[PDB]
Amino acid sequence: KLAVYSTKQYDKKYLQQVNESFGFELEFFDFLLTEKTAKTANGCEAVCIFVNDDGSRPVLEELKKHGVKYIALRCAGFNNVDLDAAKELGLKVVRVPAYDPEAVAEHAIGMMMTLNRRIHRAYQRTRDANFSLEGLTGFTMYGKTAGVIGTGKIGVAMLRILKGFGMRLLAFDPYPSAAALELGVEYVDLPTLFSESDVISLHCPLTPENYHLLNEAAFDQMKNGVMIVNTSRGALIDSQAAIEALKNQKIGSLGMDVYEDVFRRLSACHNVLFTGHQAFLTAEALTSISQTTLQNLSNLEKG
Amino acid sequence: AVYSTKQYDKKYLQQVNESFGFELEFFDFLLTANGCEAVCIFVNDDGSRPVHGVKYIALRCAGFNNVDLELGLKVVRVPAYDPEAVAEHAIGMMMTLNRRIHRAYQRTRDANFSLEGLTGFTMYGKTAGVIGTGKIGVAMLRILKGFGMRLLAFDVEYVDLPTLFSESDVISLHCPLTPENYHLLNEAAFDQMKNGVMIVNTSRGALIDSQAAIEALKNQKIGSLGMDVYDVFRRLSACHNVLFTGHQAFLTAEALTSISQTTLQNLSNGETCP
Amino acid sequence: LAVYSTKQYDKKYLQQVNESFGFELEFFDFLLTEKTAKTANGCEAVCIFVNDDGSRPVLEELKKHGVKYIALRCAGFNNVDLDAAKELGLKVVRVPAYDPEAVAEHAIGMMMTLNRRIHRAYQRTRDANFSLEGLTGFTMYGKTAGVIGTGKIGVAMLRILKGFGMRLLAFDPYPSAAALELGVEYVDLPTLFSESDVISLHCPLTPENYHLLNEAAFDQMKNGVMIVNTSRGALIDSQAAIEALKNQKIGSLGMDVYNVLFTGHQAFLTAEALTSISQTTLQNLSN
Amino acid sequence: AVYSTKQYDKKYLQQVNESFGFFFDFLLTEKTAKTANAVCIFVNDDGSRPVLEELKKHLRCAGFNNYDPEAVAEHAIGMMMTLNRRIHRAYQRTRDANFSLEGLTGFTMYGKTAGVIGTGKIGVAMLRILKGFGMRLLAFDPYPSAAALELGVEYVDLPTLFSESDVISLHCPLTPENYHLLNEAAFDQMKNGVMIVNTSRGALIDSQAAIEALKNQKIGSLGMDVYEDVFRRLSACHNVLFTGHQAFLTAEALTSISQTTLQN
């Protein structure tokens, strides 16, 4: 009954397990949706697409021409698909609007601990049995001050975790959540947060207001050899500015989760870790995405 | 006069030394020492019988096996490492294994962003089991708490091992090595545990039945294994979710400093703990 | 023409070559399947690689979509069901062979790489580790090298080896003049196995060949021997090899495939080879 | 009594030693000259007078600043093939079961033109190897070698050599005339995508000069052997392969080195 596109095995794995409850007819394609590949959908009420797959108008028309009713998104971001045209074509479109907050918080910390301890580098040594420890010197988080920017669900989840480490908590949101407050987080202005903090992590949405929020001016406030981990949108961090910092040694480590050769130079010459939008890649996180995306499909059958 | 020195060892001893103002001689080789009242040695230096006027011997580590014990020589050591750092390391291996970050870097540094096979699990729901209630275990135990995990331990909610083994979906052991301990984790254990379980040991090797583990891994009883190691390695790491790290647990500036301090005072000394 | 399982190289060289031919090209990254086949509509011709499905339904589907001709860009046609193709009046064409020289060259570079542990070095080096332990090699000059199969590839390898200053033995049931001229000496395997310190296989997969290298072969072979295999995998009894590898009768092993070096059927992946393939492939289509 | 021992040093000396019948893993410095209480040293170990003197109180290589022609030549090619074919990049892909070939395309040496700079024994040995490949051979030495001429080599204008060759390997010694022999001036001349391997002394290549050239995309690949972060960037973002003065690291060369040393 449904055909899925840009499938990766993890998609296949958890849509299926999930579908057990739904009992849909699932057909998986591993290639990008396009005008040219639009045909494949035939006999399919519904289609499932990730961020890369093409929603441009033509694709949509073509999808109609094949009797497709419903379009679903395995991800919150619906930038690819042109909604107006969809309406004109009477194609419902659906999505999953949030990811388990816990996963992104967890990932972020994981990059943090990995960077902190150069575990990623150890492996590269270890696997070939080079046990030399030079350059893997880390730091202990206990004493330190942790600065989190944004206090949404994810941001808080990160905070609980950080609190675990015995870290002292500073956060920067306009609005301060109780939930954050019961933790002991103390809200401060950025400049304060920048100087005070030896670990910074951003869990906030991009607004024109905070684009390039972390920029050269920001950097020179912050401590030397600071750790910055960003699982939020790319724009929040100013790449060029960041890079200068790394080289001139303001930033100890940087962790980036890349929404969809700087990498090679950066990764190789620095404590930079890059991960390709891995944040929600947990079984739980995937299962939820499926329940949501299938359920959405169910609902279409009756309101 | 310090032996088996590595740059970090050198770094933290020097910084700490500023308060002490001892005179430091650094050697990069194993265990020559004329003009030195005392010596500093790591785990691998040799302190048996056969081994110029050196009054005292100091250990840069908790363990005194390499050395022996009459010749008018006093021996001191550091019996603790920052509990937190090691605890901190233990998780970090865990997260790295969980999220397969170690393998992502492998891809990423060459700009491959495929995510297949990096899928992990979310710790928030999960039960967690700790072995050892020592400073380290507790320290780890807190960290785990932050995760929202549910804690069982053995030496929170204390329980017998079997109870722990079946219940726990993550395990970490932070206890010293005892005759009772040895190969504490063995086939009997592994076949108790949840399939896919993740085990991390920063504590001594003997806690785990090595061949026993491997069977388990092949058997797919164990999801991931983390070992801090005081061609199996290549094999294991390569064809499994195995991360071996070379006794890094206390490699952090704070800990290294703590070690140097405790070591340097020990030498200042009154008496102290040998 | 629509091309399937296009990988960039496939794409790059086909186009350059095209400039000569003027076909209209539509490149699809995905596998050709019964389901995919629709994608071909309006296309007289189709281009495919070893993975793609030539099995009948696909073919039927293809005709249904007006595909006059199917073109393959690799010697082997195991995937396509020829007769059925015949029934449906679809012409099927192929590329008979690859640059011989290119594949032979791979084998050698692969050999040297293993021999000198350059692969391992690079791992170290990229991190600015220059330690050399465990990277020791052996000098090929003076060594005896044995080649099995002396087809074009073998001969082309035989020359390369000859340059190194090695001694040459080869096993083919039906010898080659060319090989002889180089002064290679033909032998039976046993002699070859026992004698050679380097072995390279350049022969097709025949039932007689299967698992040509089996424990029987290995335990003849000199200790520390190096074997490089660009021919189909089945020439080698992997299980024996592993044993042999742990057992240490095998110094190094190199395999080309879809101290060990593995590479994914990369042998003919050179710009010269791909162009020649493209050109041959288009030409097939010109006809 | 040996210093700066590495397993290879030890194994081969011991083996060779049996005929002669005469080990320290650490550096020889003044501090260290007590252990001697007729010594073996490598380039790194300390040759300062003081150490010597402390020596009186109580080399395994050509360079005294403090090999088999065939081996180095062989390495040089192996370096060449690896780059050309990006095997090094594969193993990394392969070891973790990634079988994609994107970006590993190579070129077929056969019929290409190969240029050797220097025709020492090393130069020739390479030339021979290259002959096997079916390459067309050009060389540049001020003094023509007889042997090379027999191979069929045609000697040339450096400029000629630079423009014609799709492969260049340098097997000559450092001289005032050739220092920075390969400079921006050179690289500009050369074919785009050219491959360069230098096992010869480092200085023959204008390091910054290359780097631009690489960015500039004049040079397809560069192989360097380092006689005792730039390393990472280049290795990482470019087709460059660095090997640490491995050139003569073979059982055979090492054995030769050992025997000669015991004989000395």
Q: Looking at beta carbons, which residues of chain A come within 8 Å of D229?
A: 269
Tokens of B55: 């009054």
- Asked how this structure was determined, the answer is X-ray
CA distances from B236 to A128, B70, B220, C123, C131 (A): 11, 45, 13, 19, 24
Rg (CA), chain C: 22
From chain C residues 75-104, the ones with a CB under 8 A of any chain D CB are 99, 101-102
Q: Which residues pair with B170 in a beta bridge?
A: B198
The answer to whether the Cβ–Cβ distance between C101 and D94 falls below 8 Å is no
Q: Are D227 and D202 in contact (CB under 8 A)?
A: yes
Name the residue with tokens 């339904």: C57
Distance CA D66, CA B221 (A): 57
- Whether residue C119 lies within 8 A of chain D, CB to CB, comes out as yes
- The edge-to-edge listing of strands for the beta sheet with B222-228 is B150-154, B127-131, B170-173, B197-201, B222-228, B242-245
From chain A residues 156-185, the ones with a CB under 8 A of any chain B CB are 157, 160-166
User: Resolution to 1 decimal, in Å?
Assistant: 3.3
From the list D26, D35, D96, which residue is nearest B106 (CB)?
A: D96
Checking D184-189 for CB contacts under 8 A at 24+ apart, the result is D184/D209, D184/D212, D184/D213, D186/D158, D186/D162, D187/D213, D187/D216, D187/D218, D187/D219, D188/D218, D189/D159, D189/D162, D189/D163
Task: Name the minimum distance, in Å, from the CA of A87 to any CA of chain B.
Answer: 33
Q: Which H or E run contains A290?
A: helix A283-301
- The edge-to-edge listing of strands for the beta sheet with A168-172 is A186-187, A168-172, A145-149, A199-202, A226-230, A251-257, A272-275
From chain A residues 240-269, the ones with a CB under 8 A of any chain D CB are 261, 264-265, 267-269
Return phi, psi of residue B135, to 5°. -65, -40
Q: Are A120 and B224 in contact (CB under 8 A)?
A: no
Task: Name the minimum distance, in Å, from the CA of A137 to any CA of chain D.
Answer: 19
Q: How far is CA B15 from the centre of its chain?
A: 24
Give the closest residue to A255 by CA, choosing from A283, A214, A207, A221: A214
Report DSSP letters for D118-151, one per residue.
Answer: --SHHHHHHHHHHHHTT-EEEEE-SSPPHHHHHH
Distance CA A180, CA B186 (A): 43
The answer to whether the Cβ–Cβ distance between A137 and B8 falls below 8 Å is yes
Task: Name the minimum distance, in Å, from the CA of A302 to any CA of chain B.
Answer: 33
Rg (CA), chain D: 21
Task: Name the minimum distance, in Å, from the CA of A112 to any CA of chain B.
Answer: 8
The answer to whether the Cβ–Cβ distance between A278 and B98 falls below 8 Å is no
Q: Looking at beta carbons, which residues of chain A come within 8 Å of B223?
A: none
Q: Which H or E run contains B227?
A: strand B222-228
Q: Are D170 and D117 in contact (CB under 8 A)?
A: yes
Task: Name the minimum distance, in Å, from the CA of A247 to any CA of chain D.
Answer: 11
Q: HEC string of C225-253?
A: EEEEECCCHHHECHHHHHHHHHHCCEEEE
The answer to whether the Cβ–Cβ distance between D253 and C139 falls below 8 Å is yes
From the list A31, A128, A268, which residue is nearest C123 (CB)?
A: A128
From chain D residues 214-233, the ones with a CB under 8 A of any chain C CB are 226, 229, 231-232
- In this complex, which chains have at least 3 CB pairs below 8 Å with chain A? B, C, D
Task: Name the minimum distance, in Å, from the CA of B116 to any CA of chain A.
Answer: 7
Q: Which residue of B has its CA nearest to D236?
A: B110
Give the closest residue to B29 by CA, choosing from D56, D35, D7: D35
- What angle, 0 to 180 degrees and rounded to 10, lies between the N-to-C axes of helices A101-117 and A283-301? 160
Give the closest residue to C285 by CA, choosing from C95, C97, C37: C95
The answer to whether the Cβ–Cβ distance between D81 and C112 falls below 8 Å is yes
Q: Which residue of B has its CA nearest to D35?
A: B32
Domains and CATH numbers, chain C: 1-99+269-287 (3.40.50.720), 100-268 (3.40.50.720)
The answer to whether the Cβ–Cβ distance between C162 and D253 falls below 8 Å is no
From the list C30, C38, C123, which residue is nearest A31 (CB)?
A: C30
The answer to whether the Cβ–Cβ distance between D79 and C118 falls below 8 Å is yes
Give the closest residue to A236 by CA, choosing from A228, A247, A245: A228
Q: Where do the DSSP E strands lie in chain A?
A: 2-4, 26-28, 46-49, 70-73, 92-93, 145-149, 168-172, 186-187, 199-202, 226-230, 251-257, 272-275
